[PDB]
Amino acid sequence: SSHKFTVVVLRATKVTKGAFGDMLDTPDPYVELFISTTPDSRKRTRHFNNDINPVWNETFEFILDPNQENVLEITLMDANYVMDETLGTATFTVSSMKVGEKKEVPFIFNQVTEMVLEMSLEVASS
């Protein structure tokens, strides 16, 4: 049928570009979501200036087809003046979740920065 996949982009901790990159520019972070198997899905949070432990608490909704191999692509970004830098990329295969389930999935980027997401899967179609 059609499922409502809710992603709450909660927070990240110890966002870093490395020692040198952080001395040039303290990360100005945001998260970007993308699920290629659903129409205009690219979504993203607001960025925070010079914040290595950003708290977004932003809720995103994706209407998915359960026949597709739906993989949530999560990118931790740094807002820059010329070109935003991708500090890391994670994938979340929605198959791992079942309708009715709601769970916290933490992702670790570069074995240093933790990004916490809350996922929810429902059968929904109001």
Ligand SMILES: [Ca+2]
């Ligand atoms: Ca900055």
Ligand SMILES: [Ca+2]
């Ligand atoms: Ca920046």
